[PDB]
Structures are given as C-alpha cells and as structure tokens.
Design a binder for this molecule. Structure first.
Ligand SMILES: *[C@@H]1O[C@H](CO)[C@@H](O[C@@H]2O[C@H](CO)[C@@H](O)[C@H](O)[C@H]2NC(C)=O)[C@H](O)[C@H]1NC(C)=O
Ligand SMILES: *[C@@H]1O[C@H](CO)[C@@H](O[C@@H]2O[C@H](CO)[C@@H](O)[C@H](O)[C@H]2NC(C)=O)[C@H](O)[C@H]1NC(C)=O
Lengths: 376, 376
C-alpha cells in the first residue's frame, strides 16, 4: 500500500496544469509508495475559499499540499502553513519574504530582469505592470532606478476596466508619448500582455524603434507571431528549454496525448506553470522517498482535527516534511531544481530570448550566480 | 435589555483606540438598545489569527464587527465578510477595490495628496514609502507622474530593523545628498514619521530649503514642535478639526478621563485612528437605531453556526444591516460622515496644514468635488 495523502488546490480553468499534474503522477509513480491526491478546484483569489479548502485537506489528514495562490490569497496560505507546519508546494509567484513551509517551484525573475535591462543599456523606459504577483518587482526596479539614475515611468495597468477599456489605452499612450517612450517592460498577467500587445499593434507602436521586454518566465507560452513582423524588438525569458533532451522527450509524449483526456495537452509547448506543476510531483515524490530512505516515520497517529483548534499545536512531523522537500535536488522540465532554507529556487538558469522574423531565439542565459551570459 | 451584540477586533497595542471605543459606547448608548461588544485582542497581521477571531465572533452571533486589518490580513476580512454578509466597520486603510460588507471610516488620502503636490508646483521630489504599511498611494503618484510631469525618487523606508535605524535613516538622507533632493514626501505611520523627523533634525535637514509633506491624516497627532523652528516647510493633512465645537466639547471630556481607566486618553489631541473609532460607534448605533425606526427585524433566530460550514449560505438580514450602515449620515470627530454604496467616505473634508513658528495652521481644505481650496 504505502498510500501518502496529499492535497491539490487548483484554480478553476487551470486545465493544462492539472493535466501536467496527472502526467506527473503517472511518470513518477513507483511501487515504493503512492501519492494519493485529494483535489479541490476553486477560485484562488477568494481567501474564504482557499481557507475552506486548506482546512478541509488539513482535517482529512494530508501530508503536504500542492497548489496555487494569488496576491489576494498568499497570506492565507503562508499564515495557515506556517502556523500548522503544513508544507505548501506551489508554482505561483515566490512569496515576498522567508515564510517557512512554502516550497516555491517558480524561480525569482527580478535579477534576470534587472540584468537584461542593463544588458540593453536602458536608462529610461516604461514599466507597465499589474499586481497579481505582488509588487516586489516594482520595488526592485524603483530601487535600481534611484541607484543607477534611470528615468522609469511606472504605471499600474491592472485596473483598466475591460468594460470600457479603450479610452483608457489612448490616455495611457498619451502619457507615454509625453516623453516619447519607446522602451517598454510588460510585467502583467498573461491575458493582460496580450491585450496590451493588440493595443500596441493597433496604434502602430509595434514597428522599428520600439522595444518590449515581456517580464515573465514563458516568452513562447503565448502568441508572438502577431508582433513578429512589425519591426519592434521583443525580448523575454524562458525557464523551459525545448532543446534539453529531457524536455524534448516529454514534449514528444505531451504533444500526442489525447486532448479530451488531457485538456491543454496536445501541443508543442507547455506553459511554464504547467511544467512547474509536473516538476512539483517529482519533488514531492523525492521528498517522501528520502524520508523513507532515512527511516523517518511521519505517519499520523491521530486525526489532524480542526484547522481552527485553539491552541494551534503543530504536528511534530511537520518540520521533518518541510526539510525533506527543501533538500530535494533533481532535474526537471524547468532545469536544475534546488532550494534554499526558505524554499526558494537556487542554482537555476533562465534563458534570455529575442523575437526574430524566423521565430523566438535564445541569445543567452541568466545564471542564479553568474548573471547574464551571451551565447556565441 | 435590548442587547445587540457586536464584535471588536483590536490590534494588540491599540490602547487609545480601545479607550476611544469605550468612550463612544458611553456617549451614544441609549434606552432603546445597548451595543454589547465582544472584544478580541490579536496579532492583526496574522491571517490565521484574524480568521480565528472572525470565526469566533461569527459563531457567537454578532450582528456586525468593528475592527482593524493589516495589508496582510485585509483579504481575509473582505473575503469572509463578503461571503457571509457580515459587516465589518473599520478605521483602517480603505480597501483597494469595491469590496462589499466593509464600512470604511477612513477617507481616501490620495486625491488631497496629489492635489497638494500640484499646489506647491513640485516637479521633482523624493517619496519615502513604508512597504510594511502599503504601496497604494505611492502607486497613485507613480501613475500620475507622467501626466503631471513629475520626477519621483521612491525610497522604501519599510524594512528597517530597529537595531540600526539611526544609521539607516542617516544613510538614506546622506544619499539623497546626491541628486540634491530637498522636497520629500513621508507617507508613514505617525511613529515612523517621528523617527524620521528625529533623524532629519539630527542631520540638520530641517532647515530652510527643505520641504516635507507628511502623507497621513493626522498632521498634529505627533510632535511637530521639535521641527518647528528649523526653517523647513512641513505640510500635512488633518481630518479631526479641533476648532469644531463637537470636537472641542469631546476633548474637554477626553482630557479629563483618568489615564488608568482610559489608556491614551488624558491628552489634548487624539490620533485620527481613535477619532474614527469613536465615530464608528456612532455609525453603528445610528444604523441599528434606523433599522428599528423602519421595523426591519434583524434578530437572528438560529445560531450563526461555523464560519466553515459548507455550503456557505449567508443570512438573509446581512444585506439590510449593510445597507443601514451605509445609509447613516452623521457629523462626528472626523467631520461629516457619509458613505457610498461601497462603504467609502463621501462628501468628507481634509484640512491642509503647514507648520509655522506659532504652530500648525490650517491653510485650506480638500473636498471630493472642489479639490484643493486655499483658506481666507
Ligand atoms: C532594437 O535593437 C536594436 C539592435 O540592437 C537596437 O539598435 C542598436 O542599439 C544602439 C543604440 O541605439 C545603436 O547605436 C546600434 O547601432 C544598434 N545596432 C544595430 C546594428 O542596429 C535598438 O536600440 C533597439 N530598439 C530600441 C528602441 O531600443
Ligand atoms: C517653502 O515654501 C515657500 C512658499 O510656498 C516656497 O516658495 C517661496 O515662495 C515663492 C513662491 O515660489 C518663491 O519665489 C520663494 O523663493 C520661496 N521662498 C523662499 C525664501 O524660498 C519655497 O520654495 C519652499 N521651500 C521648498 C524647498 O520647497
């Protein structure tokens, strides 16, 4: 048997991620033990919902929770996890701090972004953002601006009501035009980028003389073809490397999976959040394997009880499970996976990309310790 | 014997605010009914703690909750209140959105601040912000910077370990001794403002040629006397007008209370947060009084239950309570109190202040519809 109960907290509509999760469950299945996921699908921005689901898993008796949060709900997660010693493994944006009991699959992007800016020798640009992943990056660029004498125009595009969102664009570009802004960073939710890209194309700002940096880890995850021929420079970041044999092999299978059975999966690419979901199954699997290999018993003796029991007394095995997960080092879709004591990715690589007439191309990479290295 | 129960969620050090709350309960109590508060003292930044306390008050069957939140716990409050139709009345920062079931006693400060900056005809300035407290008003000035043609140098003053503090704050100003920054916006809690004022004085930057804008609603809550004679301009905002008889008559009383019975309350001034709290007791009282004047029965028949009951079916009378709360229009320590449909203060007034050798003086006022008006 060896059935190991875990929770799965999935946003509604995260079909590809859940398909990647199930493929991960197949890939990393083993006779040693079985991960036994209990799945909740919910509105990840709704803290009540996230608390209900967390507590429901907790009372069932899970040994770890894999899932997602939003900026509206990250504090529910870090606070419940930290209080009860339950480990959360997530592909979402890294928490802004050193919160314990959170294993963060997603590498920090800020460093690479700052180096890229320096690399193109920008000292004046617009930073167009929303806040769904917090404001860490905004702070990082403001700090750099002050320190390197950059003139940054930083504008929150997150709050343009899509119910009348067009006069709002003209006024945005009017503001940008005041200083003839031509270098632009887009750090937004993926549909937000696409909205902004259409908006740019429409007013002819996708021509030569413009240069956009897409500040996310999935440059090729969405539709680049529409700005591929206008003449503007377009650059970005990619944590999933389709030239890795490991990734290449996975895509051979992924690309042929039955779409009815694996929604989101009959394609040549996989979104980085889905790749990280797949990699998370490997990490959890290795953690429980390592514990068993170390002869560390983590089996629950009694019921977890109510997540709101007062006083909140953390189970003693919590720390053990946190440590096992943080000590995992493996190779996955997102390259070398290793964590520091705070569950943040270290020793990872981010590929730096440029859009060219013949498609997106790697021009080099950013190293978690060597910064930006061009490929010759 | 008409006991309407309510909750009070008080941050673990909010002594003066609790004193203010207890005073308002006396001032506004009546033979009609007695608000019967149940009080929790808690780590307001701890979302788990906040959920526990909310759920504990929900189970008791309170008819509303007066309380405080933090930027880390605000989502817990809005989600739980919005889901369960439990009204939260608070002097905390207004929410970033139109969340329902939240009565925000504190007026928005962004308009007045943006207006004041324009008034002084600033184009280049430093903005000291406190990440602990939030970035919301910084963002508003960053959004506006293009259209209003400003060059903003934003510095985070928010992760200072009190160990150093002195050294950090001096390093900060001896760094603004680079771009020749002399116009500085504060945007901090009154304590952090005091700390900074203390260091500006020690560094000798409170002289003529520097100008500080304190971006909180309590210009005279702190000690201005010490920076009054240096020669620097110092401007701020004030919502509690001590020239009003209502306020003067209140302070007559407040200055008299025994400090042992009412911590924080043997003084001439009163923090705008405590004033908003006193005001909150009037609003809650009027709302529930008005529900009776309209023979809207709101008495719960059966137990409220568990905040984690599933499915979540909100009680029928929540919406009536919310509406009654939002329909209240009274005059209080913070001036005319009125709310829109999203529980935000409307038709309120913010006084504009400058520090003079003879003390703080009102120089004008800011209105929702008139914007900035020089007084004469
Ligand atoms: C788009 O990329 C091009 C190519 O690097 C940039 O043009 C180069 O950059 C410098 C600075 O303007 C020029 O002096 C070089 O001569 C350019 N190289 C070549 C061969 O074209 C250009 O600056 C980028 N666009 C924007 C708006 O930043
Ligand atoms: C402090 O306040 C004064 C008045 O608002 C600022 O401007 C003074 O008044 C006029 C109006 O521009 C100027 O022509 C004078 O030169 C200013 N007076 C003096 C003696 O400086 C003044 O600039 C403010 N100080 C700062 C640093 O903003």
């Amino acid at each position: 048997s060896n059935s190991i109960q875990i929770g799965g907290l999935f946003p509604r509509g995260a079909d590809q991620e859940y398909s990647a999760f199930r493929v991960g469950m197949v890939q990393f299945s083993t006779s040693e033990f079985r991960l036994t996921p209990h799945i909740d699908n919910l509105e990840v921005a709704n803290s009540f919902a996230v608390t209900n689901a967390f507590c429901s898993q907790f009372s069932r008796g899970v040994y770890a929770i894999f899932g997602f949060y939003d900026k509206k709900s990250v504090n529910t997660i870090t606070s419940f996890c930290g209080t009860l010693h339950v480990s959360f493994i997530t592909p979402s944006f890294p928490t802004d701090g050193t919160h314990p009991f959170v294993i963060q699959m997603r590498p920090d992007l800020k460093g690479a972004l700052l180096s890229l800016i320096e690399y193109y020798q920008w000292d004046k640009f617009a930073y167009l953002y929303d806040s769904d992943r917090g404001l860490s990056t905004l702070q990082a660029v403001l700090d750099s601006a002050a320190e390197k004498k950059w003139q940054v125009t930083a504008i929150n595009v997150g709050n343009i009501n899509n119910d009348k969102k067009d006069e709002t664009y003209r006024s945005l570009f009017q503001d940008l035009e005041l200083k003839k802004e031509r270098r632009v960073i887009l750090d937004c939710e993926r549909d937000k980028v696409n909205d902004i890209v259409d908006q740019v194309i429409t007013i002819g700002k996708h021509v030569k003389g413009y240069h956009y940096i897409i500040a996310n880890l999935g440059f090729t995850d969405g539709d680049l073809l529409k700005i591929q021929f206008g003449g503007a420079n377009v650059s970005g970041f990619q944590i999933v490397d389709y030239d890795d044999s490991l990734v290449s092999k996975f895509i051979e299978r992924w690309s042929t999976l039955e779409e009815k059975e694996y929604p989101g999966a009959h394609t040549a690419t996989i979104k980085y959040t889905s790749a990280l979901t797949y990699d998370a199954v490997q990490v959890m699997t290795e953690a429980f394997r390592n514990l068993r290999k170390q002869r560390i018993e983590i089996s629950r003796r009694g019921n977890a009880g109510d997540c709101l029991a007062n006083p909140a007394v953390p189970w003693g095995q919590g720390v053990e499970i946190e440590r096992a997960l943080k000590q995992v080092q493996v190779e996955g879709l997102s390259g070398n996976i290793k964590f520091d004591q705070n569950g943040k990715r270290i020793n990872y690589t981010i590929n730096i990309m440029e859009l060219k007439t013949n498609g997106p191309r790697k021009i080099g990479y950013w190293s978690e310790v060597d910064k930006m290295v061009v490929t010759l």
